[PDB]
Amino acid sequence: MKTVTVKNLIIGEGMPKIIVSLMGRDINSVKAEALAYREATFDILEWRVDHFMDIASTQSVLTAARVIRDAMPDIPLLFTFRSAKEGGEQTITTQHYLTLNRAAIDSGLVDMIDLELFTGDADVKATVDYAHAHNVYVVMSNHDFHQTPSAEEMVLRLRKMQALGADIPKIAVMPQSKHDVLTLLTATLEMQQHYADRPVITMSMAKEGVISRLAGEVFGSAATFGAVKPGQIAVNDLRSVLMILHNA
Amino acid sequence: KTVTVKNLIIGEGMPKIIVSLMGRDINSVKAEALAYREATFDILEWRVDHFMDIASTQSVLTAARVIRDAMPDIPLLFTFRSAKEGGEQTITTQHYLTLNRAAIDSGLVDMIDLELFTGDADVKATVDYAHAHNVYVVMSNHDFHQTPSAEEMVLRLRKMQALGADIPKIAVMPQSKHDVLTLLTATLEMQQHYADRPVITMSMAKEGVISRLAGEVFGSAATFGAVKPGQIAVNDLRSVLMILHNA
Ligand SMILES: C[C@H]1C(=O)[C@@H](O)[C@H](O)C[C@]1(O)C(=O)O
Numbered sequence: 265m266k267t268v269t270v271k272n273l274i275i276g277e278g279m280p281k282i283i284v285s286l287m288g289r290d291i292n293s294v295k296a297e298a299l300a301y302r303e304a305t306f307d308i309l310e311w312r313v314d315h316f317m318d319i320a321s322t323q324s325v326l327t328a329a330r331v332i333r334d335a336m337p338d339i340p341l342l343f344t345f346r347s348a349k350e351g352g353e354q355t356i357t358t359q360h361y362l363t364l365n366r367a368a369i370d371s372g373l374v375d376m377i378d379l380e381l382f383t384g385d386a387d388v389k390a391t392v393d394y395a396h397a398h399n400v401y402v403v404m405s406n407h408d409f410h411q412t413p414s415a416e417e418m419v420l421r422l423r424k425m426q427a428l429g430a431d432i433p434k435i436a437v438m439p440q441s442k443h444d445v446l447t448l449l450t451a452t453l454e455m456q457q458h459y460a461d462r463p464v465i466t467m468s469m470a471k472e473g474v475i476s477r478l479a480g481e482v483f484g485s486a487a488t489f490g491a492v493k494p495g496q497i498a499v500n501d502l503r504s505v506l507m508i509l510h511n512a
Numbered sequence: 513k514t515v516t517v518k519n520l521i522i523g524e525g526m527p528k529i530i531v532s533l534m535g536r537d538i539n540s541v542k543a544e545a546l547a548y549r550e551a552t553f554d555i556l557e558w559r560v561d562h563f564m565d566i567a568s569t570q571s572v573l574t575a576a577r578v579i580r581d582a583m584p585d586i587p588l589l590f591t592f593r594s595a596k597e598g599g600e601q602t603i604t605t606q607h608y609l610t611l612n613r614a615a616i617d618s619g620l621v622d623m624i625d626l627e628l629f630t631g632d633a634d635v636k637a638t639v640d641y642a643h644a645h646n647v648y649v650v651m652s653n654h655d656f657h658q659t660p661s662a663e664e665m666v667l668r669l670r671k672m673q674a675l676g677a678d679i680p681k682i683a684v685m686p687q688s689k690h691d692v693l694t695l696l697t698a699t700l701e702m703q704q705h706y707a708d709r710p711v712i713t714m715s716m717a718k719e720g721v722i723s724r725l726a727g728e729v730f731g732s733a734a735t736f737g738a739v740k741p742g743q744i745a746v747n748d749l750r751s752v753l754m755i756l757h758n759a
């Protein structure tokens with residue numbers, strides 16, 4: 265199990281790491297959230313770039329990145345444009361997605377980038393190599409906000425992410441039943457004990473899936489998503505459960 | 513259905529917290545019952561198998577009286593766990609039935625524990641005796657070595673319902689991480705497709721801890737906490753159950 269050490273956070277060891285997601289529609293609103301999030305205790309800051317309106321301007325995007333980086337200079341910073349297709353806030357062409365992600369990478373302002381598995385294999389390969397050339401780590405991601413694929417399909421996707429050079433494969437799926445939550449946990453475990461040689465993040469969405477945000481140390485998810493301000497768990501509550509589990 | 517003891521409704525809301533009282537003699541039992549008044553929990557289990565002076569029914573019942581004296585309004589479950597199923601000692605079947613009939617008669621306890629594998633005829637006879645005296649049965653099966661198939665566990669929990677258990681209960685020892693999922697799988701199947709009453713399930717040890725926490729999710733109506741591995745301090749346990757319940 266290779267691990268990813270960012271700043272001094274070690275992902276894939278110990279208790280799962282708590283990610284919070286910062287959403288801002290403009291520079292002022294990113295800055296407001298950056299100030300408010302800075303009071304809070306968590307492990308990784310995800311900047312959800314798809315909420316930012318001025319995405320046509322790479323310079324504006326990089327100004328927003330710099331504000332966040334400067335607000336929390338020591339926090340692992342993850343740059344994420346989530347496509348509408350996978351539950352994001354707006355549409356983007358594959359060429360512009362690549363422009364932003366490459367600009368984030370070569371800016372030096374971010375520690376990790378999110379890259380969607382189903383962007384296209386040539387574009388994903390290329391972008392993984394560029395990130396690695398610039399010492400940025402890749403969280404490769406797939407989300408299904410409608411339903412849960414079979415255990416075997418989910419494992420196939422995570423394994424393809426490893427094959428593509430992902431530092432941290434990630435998958436998030438929507439339960440339609442409690443059975444679906446067991447399927448996601450079963451997929452996580454198979455990955456952990458038969459395939460994973462790097463950290464993997466998995467989650468079952470919504471109220472039904474909350475247990476998957478708590479059970480990561482047990483079945484093999486290396487990070488979880490927490491809220492500063494269904495399924496969303498406040499970071500101090502989240503950390504409480506993770507410690508209690510860890511020390512049992 | 514649910515099961516109500518002293519206003520505690522088992523089978524609704526958050527999983528109920530059981531704490532076990534474990535004293536080897538009357539001194540220690542009296543001292544523990546007093547200290548246990550300071551903790552917050554839903555159900556008090558008296559683990560009768562820890563008690564050394566076990567041959568004397570009168571001695572056992574006196575220990576029950578001390579407990580009831582310290583905590584008059586707590587739901588009280590009288591449990592002799594045979595060594596076979598993880599307990600501290602073994603008694604004759606006859607004395608096991610004698611001790612349980614004595615607890616039932618005494619009016620001092622609200623529930624008894626009967627082990628499913630005690631024998632079908634003896635089990636039904638005791639279940640009927642309990643209900644005749646308005647005492648509920650937690651029917652139990654524990655495997656401290658391994659985890660049976662989810663199919664086998666569901667079959668056991670259904671067989672407990674068939675013999676009249678008010679609350680079927682299985683606790684099993686995980687050997688693999690998969691074993692923990694298997695227990696959760698059996699739990700969900702029971703609750704959603706078979707259970708017409710509350711059911712308690714647990715995966716033991718550290719590996720199984722999530723099963724102590726996730727009862728609301730997968731269908732276990734109660735869990736075990738400690739006042740003093742895989743054990744969780746009652747206050748910590750309560751904290752986690754509330755975070756899950758209120759999400
Ligand atoms: C899983 C979480 C994310 O993907 C974040 O980017 C998002 O802001 C919140 C989230 O969807 C969640 O906590 O359910």
Ligand SMILES: C[C@H]1C(=O)[C@@H](O)[C@H](O)C[C@]1(O)C(=O)O
Pocket residue numbers: 532557559683714716717736737
């Ligand atoms: C399942 C639990 C019990 O049955 C209690 O009698 C015992 O004290 C503790 C227990 O074995 C547990 O919490 O694992």
